[PDB]
Design a protein around this ligand. Structure first.
Ligand SMILES: C[C@@H](Oc1ccc(Oc2ncc(Cl)cc2Cl)cc1)C(=O)O
Ligand SMILES: O=C(O)CCC(=O)C(=O)O
Ligand SMILES: O=C(O)CCC(=O)C(=O)O
Ligand SMILES: [Mn+2]
Ligand SMILES: [Mn+2]
Lengths: 264, 289
């Protein structure tokens, strides 16, 4: 890395990137290094990037087409820029407070999400991430061989479920179209059953994979500060909100980068 | 606000659940009463506290530890030459044996009187890799439903070291290297003790869950089949990600964790890299409701 400075967060995933101004267009050499760090570290974040809504969209477009997720509210004037907002007065349960990755009920879920902290507490409201590369790679060779050929049925029936009940089928293990690396691909929010198996057969196996994937040693924990811009890979990671900031205002915006069909 | 409540130290909470960074103090020196009382208050509130940039000697490490209570080294760990009170969490860059403490537990709960706290000091740690996770058993308890609390608050739990250096350990394959771990008597590993499932912290007066899957064998009076589901639920509940924090280490960071109201976990993400911390253990008293 010669155009940026990269500081890995853990031995598994996550890296802080400095030495670059996201308010400006990125030359080829700088963009290529950012993409290289993204593919390697899977979640990357840039402190001190007070970027406008328009600069947010422009940066996001470098990753791919900006295709908003279905269920979130957009800011006035910018359909692409969606809100993760919780009022100080707000009670109840937080958006995304279980391990998941976004919108896997889609035939082509999002490739990536670009999140920008606008107003965040001095402490509280971290976001957890984990690597599905590491999840797959830490399975024994025998377990890998055993489940590699399985497919899993996804649907949105528990988030907003007619379109919420529509099923799609994804491989249990997918090859990342950018890195070429294999990762586990299951999540408790959207996965319904292993295709072809009975309920009794499927439930314990999915349950094990949920437990395995979310092992603490496969995770990292990102702390937010105002003007922090973060990108996560929606194919090879999962993420989780942390609701430890009752009574405090928390506001981030996000753009969603379109992806292609998950493939073996 | 912390900036105005604390006059001798500066406190920066790590999460909304537990953990805090402490600065404005020199651990090389004896602590005056007001400074110590503020540290103890922060310890009781935040449950795991750490002090970056404290380049201290073994003697100073021991002296600071003694403010929390009497030193009482844990049975399993080797000590450094010249300092029986200072034990090692040391992993050579080339070793590939099981990593010490790589699942959620708290220390030596098989003792009739487990440690009250541990003071850990980073000697030589990787630039990245080897974080320690912590979680609050106050929060774990307080987030159970009223009905689940009523159901289990009267239970007691059987603890032993059998999976660490007793019969169950000796009957399996994953072994610890002799870098930091002593050879132990198998009968000592199998010795059972019974503690309450919910305990009152003597310093804070608060109630916390008290179970861990390393040392807990079963709920007293129950069969294994009866105990397995309740205990397994409690482990899953306590280790919910939103009940945790994650501490990253740097050389000369000194950390204190409360061995009664927290659990902790090593993270084995630094294969091929040297990692060395020292630690003193503060003696505790019999866990009580
Ligand atoms: C110093 C410490 O002793 C321990 C040693 C290893 C250990 O590792 C584990 N980690 C995870 C699992 Cl599942 C089993 C185990 Cl056995 C835990 C504790 C103590 O208790 O005083
Ligand atoms: O608020 C957070 O930390 C993450 C929420 C989430 O899951 C998302 O934005 O998709
Ligand atoms: O090495 C670590 O991070 C923690 C090891 C541990 O569990 C202990 O020292 O008791
Ligand atoms: Mn999400
Ligand atoms: Mn331990």
């Amino acid at each position: 890395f010669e155009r940026i400075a990269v500081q890995p967060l853990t031995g598994v995933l996550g890296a802080e990137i400095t030495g670059v101004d996201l308010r400006e267009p990125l030359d080829d050499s700088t963009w290529n290094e950012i993409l290289d760090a993204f593919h390697t570290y899977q979640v990357i974040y840039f402190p001190g990037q007070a970027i406008t809504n328009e600069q947010h969209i422009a940066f996001s477009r470098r990753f791919g087409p900006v295709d908003p997720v279905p269920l979130l509210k957009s800011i006035e004037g910018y359909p692409e820029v969606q809100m993760i907002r919780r009022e100080a007065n707000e009670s109840g349960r937080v958006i995304g407070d279980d391990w998941h990755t976004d919108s896997t009920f889609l035939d082509a879920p999002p490739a990536a999400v670009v999140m920008r902290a606008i107003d965040v507490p001095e402490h509280g409201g971290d976001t957890g991430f984990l690597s599905m590369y590491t999840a797959w790679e830490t399975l024994s060779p025998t377990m890998q061989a055993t489940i590699e050929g399985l497919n899993v049925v996804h649907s949105a029936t528990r988030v907003f479920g007619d379109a919420g009940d529509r099923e799609t089928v994804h491989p249990l293990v997918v090859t990342h179209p950018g890195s070429g690396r294999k990762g586990l691909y299951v999540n408790q929010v959207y996965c319904q059953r292993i295709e072809g198996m009975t309920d009794a057969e499927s439930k314990p196996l999915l349950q094990f994979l949920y437990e395995h994937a979310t092992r603490f040693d496969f995770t990292c924990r990102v702390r937010w500060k105002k003007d922090q811009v973060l990108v996560w890979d929606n194919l090879c990671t999962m993420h989780r909100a942390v609701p430890d900031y009752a009574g405090k205002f928390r506001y981030l915006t996000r753009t969603t980068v379109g992806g292609v069909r998950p493939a073996r």
